[PDB]
């Protein structure tokens, strides 16, 4: 499911920033409400947060599995995979 995850729009999934050059972003957790070519708009308990994909690592809850995904892998428009 790790491979299938890269091929779909992450909208609707729960994700958590587990690694980032900006410490301020580590821990940002919530539901992806939008995905752009370079960012993820995440709805958190504290509010909406936009986090860049490149250089970040995300913990993702998908298909009963919990995976660590490097932002570089999804740093493309979702429709382009």
Curated annotation (Swiss-Prot):
Keyword rRNA processing included in the entry's annotation:
no
Signal peptide position in this chain? Answer: none
Listed under catalytic activity are: Endonucleolytic cleavage of RNA, removing 5'-extranucleotides from tRNA precursor
EC numbers on record: 3.1.26.5
A molecular-function term among this protein's GO annotations: ribonuclease P RNA binding
- Which enzyme class, named as a word? hydrolase
Q: Where in the cell is it found?
A: Cytoplasm
Q: Which GO terms describe its cellular component?
A: cytoplasm; ribonuclease MRP complex; ribonuclease P complex
Q: According to its UniProt record, where is this protein mainly located?
A: cytoplasm
> Per UniProt, which keywords does this protein have?
Cytoplasm, Endonuclease, Hydrolase, Nuclease, tRNA processing
Q: Name one GO biological process term.
A: rRNA processing
Q: Which family does it belong to?
A: Belongs to the eukaryotic/archaeal RNase P protein component 1 family.
- Main role? Part of ribonuclease P, a protein complex that generates mature tRNA molecules by cleaving their 5'-ends.
Its assembly, as annotated, is: Consists of a catalytic RNA component and at least 4-5 protein subunits.
Q: What is this protein called?
A: Ribonuclease P protein component 1
Q: Can you name the source organism? A: Archaeoglobus fulgidus (strain ATCC 49558 / DSM 4304 / JCM 9628 / NBRC 100126 / VC-16)
Portion of the parent chain present:
6 to 86 of 102
């Amino acid at each position: 499911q790790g491979v299938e995850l890269i091929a779909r729009d992450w909208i609707g999934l729960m994700v958590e920033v587990v690694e980032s050059p900006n410490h301020s972003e580590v821990g940002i957790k919530g539901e992806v409400v939008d995905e752009t070519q370079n960012t993820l708009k995440i709805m958190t308990e504290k509010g909406l947060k936009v986090v860049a994909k490149r250089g970040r690592t995300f913990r993702v809850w998908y298909k009963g599995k919990i995976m660590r995904i490097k932002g570089d892998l999804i740093n493309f428009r979702p429709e382009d995979r």
